[PDB]
Design a protein around this ligand. Structure first.
Ligand SMILES: CC(C)CN(C[C@@H](O)[C@H](Cc1cccc(F)c1)NC(=O)O[C@H]1[C@H]2CO[C@H]3OC[C@@H]1[C@H]3C2)S(=O)(=O)c1ccc2nc(NC3CC3)sc2c1
Lengths: 99, 99
């Protein structure tokens, strides 16, 4: 699709057997999801944003279906206020900005 | 232009007589710039992001030239780690996401 930006660019994702909504976020290097139940091992990481940092669990080689496209990569799970799809996965689905 | 997302989507902006770089950020509702010298009145505001909140100065009807396109709107100025162009201004320059 083409998505204009008059509203937040939310999409449906499927990850870990679960359906969620997430924001297509060109300002995010990485993908950060709300606390959720994922299988597998993970590693602790801290990440920064506008208001300081948060501790996240880093999961690698996770499958995520984003508005009907499949992608595999790193997903960070922790206390983010919004589910964010970052450039690590936006590149895999072929997303571009245009103006 | 069309911008792919293998690198951060940075652009040059001109605001308040000054040249800066900023990130085209579809995950940002509003535009948030580093502390900088802007003329005019402003109002205090707090905004939230991944790691808590920050206090910003809200300036309205500010002219900003973003990669060669002009836009007028609200700019929030405060301790953000990165200069962010949000959807309030991305819509004015006609920016879309595509995949
Ligand atoms: C600050 C930008 C630079 C980065 N952020 C991505 C922005 O798009 C976030 C998304 C957002 C939206 C809503 C709530 C949020 F909690 C967060 N928007 C944002 O703060 O906007 C603020 C501000 C704008 O107006 C309004 O609109 C939303 C909200 C409110 C006030 S990030 O989430 O912090 C991030 C994400 C991934 C990531 N990966 C990293 N990896 C390591 C470096 C390698 S670091 C890193 C940091």
């Amino acid at each position: 699709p083409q998505i204009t930006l008059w509203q937040r660019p939310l999409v449906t994702i499927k990850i870990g057997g679960q359906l969620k909504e997430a924001l297509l976020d060109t300002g995010a290097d990485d993908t950060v999801l709300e606390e959720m139940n994922l299988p597998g091992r993970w590693k602790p990481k801290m990440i920064g944003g506008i208001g300081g940092f948060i501790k996240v669990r880093q999961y690698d080689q996770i499958l995520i279906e984003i508005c009907g496209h499949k992608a595999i990569g790193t997903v960070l799970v922790g206390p983010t206020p919004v589910n964010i799809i970052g450039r690590n996965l936006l590149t895999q689905i072929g997303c571009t900005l245009n103006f």
